[PDB]
């Protein structure tokens, strides 16, 4: 819970004092996976700018949170012999789903 809260606090502190978020040299992956730490609306936005300028969901965020939870704890092929590891895995899945539901409303 402290790791998830620290991640949420870092994500809130990153996209508050950095208004630069648009097309630029070296900003390709900062539009799809950067749906969390994404800037405001641009100056030359198009009509359907809800997908190419700011998608209305953390689309790449959930897989990244799942991969971070898988890399932060080295789960093995015998990590569910009792409910101790499986309970932490269920808690990690529930925390990832809660963070996804929270980040989905970020673009609105």
């Amino acid at each position: 819970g402290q790791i998830c809260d620290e991640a949420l606090q870092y994500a809130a502190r990153l996209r508050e004092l950095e208004p630069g978020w648009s097309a630029t040299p070296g900003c390709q992956l900062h539009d799809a996976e950067q749906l969390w730490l994404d800037p405001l609306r641009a100056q030359t936005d198009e009509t359907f700018l809800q997908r190419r300028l700011r998608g209305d969901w953390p689309a790449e965020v959930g897989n990244r949170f799942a991969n971070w939870l898988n890399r932060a704890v080295s789960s093995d092929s015998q990590i569910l012999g009792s409910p101790e590891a499986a309970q932490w895995s269920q808690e990690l899945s529930k925390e990832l789903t809660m963070f996804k539901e929270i980040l989905e409303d970020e673009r609105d």
Partner: protein, 305 residues
């Protein structure tokens, strides 16, 4: 102690040259008694004309920079002072050490009175937000907004009016603008059970306080114990050590209409938990309740979990 009808959110509030020390044993964030007294003074200024009440606060601390320095390879800190004017001669005689701090706090106030009953919703928030900008919240001035991206978002959020899913959506919408902060809540029950845990030798509360907030390193007969949270010692109200007096009795009182007492601080426990990790925001309001029979004058937060 009454649950409020509305949570009037005071926005990002830069306050400069605050009181850092705030207690004889702490030096960090200012006392929450300053916040409850600030809300009571704001009530005495605006709420009598607005026909409302104001009780609680949400202390979130978006940023905090102290006026300290770490002097030349030491593990401690010292305080930055301010040069005072001279005496009748050029002595620079007395230098009393008090700290300062700049903090960006944002409070949320519990309203009780006729908020929506006889008054509008945005106008009361506009009036209280332009009223709280001409006073001081902890011992230092409340800096106004002169920078860019003009917010003025005094969200006068209603709580008891609406369906339950709309109410939870309102709570998670108000928590969106508490984004980098950290709410401070008392944990008196935690200090009590942590006192009962180490009562094997001598169950002093001032020893359970002074051996919990630290990092107690203890090896294997090679680690530090697991940090349960962001535990801080805070002043949790006063405690009298002299009986009550009459208004004009005690020499040099602040005013000769209210009685005087000689009191002494009480040190409670507190936590800086993220605003996402609370069910409702009205769970984390600081009220000050007093028991004038004995000497306890305690501010705390009920329903803190």
């Amino acid at each position: 102690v009454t649950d409020p009808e509305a949570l009037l959110l005071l926005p990002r509030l830069s306050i400069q040259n605050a009181n850092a020390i705030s207690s004889p044993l702490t030096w960090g964030f200012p006392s929450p008694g300053a916040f409850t007294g600030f809300v009571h003074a704001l009530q005495r200024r605006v709420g009598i004309s607005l026909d409302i009440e104001l009780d609680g606060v949400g202390i979130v601390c978006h940023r905090f920079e102290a006026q300290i320095s770490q002097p030349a390879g030491k593990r401690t800190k010292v305080f930055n002072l301010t040069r005072n004017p001279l005496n009748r001669d050029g002595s620079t005689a007395a230098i009393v050490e008090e700290g300062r701090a700049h903090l960006e706090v944002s409070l949320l106030l519990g309203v009780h009175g006729d908020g929506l009953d006889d008054h509008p919703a945005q106008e009361i928030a506009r009036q209280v937000q332009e009223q709280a900008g001409a006073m001081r919240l902890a011992g230092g001035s409340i800096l106004p907004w002169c920078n860019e991206r003009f917010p003025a978002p005094n969200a006068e959020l209603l709580m008891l009016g609406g369906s339950d899913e709309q109410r939870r959506k309102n709570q998670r919408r108000l928590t969106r603008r508490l984004l980098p902060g950290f709410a401070l809540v008392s944990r008196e029950a935690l200090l009590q059970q942590h006192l009962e845990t180490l009562r094997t030798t001598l169950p002093e509360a001032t020893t359970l306080d002074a051996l919990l907030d630290l990092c107690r390193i203890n090896f294997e007969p090679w680690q530090v114990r697991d940090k349960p949270g962001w535990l801080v010692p805070i002043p949790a109200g006063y405690n009298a050590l002299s009986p009550l007096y009459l208004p004009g009795e005690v020499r040099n009182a602040r005013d000769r209409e209210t009685p005087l007492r000689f009191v002494e601080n009480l040190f409670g426990l507190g936590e800086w938990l993220s605003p996402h990790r609370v069910a409702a925001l009205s769970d984390l309001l600081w009220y000050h309740h007093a028991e004038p029979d004995k000497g306890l004058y305690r501010w705390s937060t009920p329903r803190f979990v």
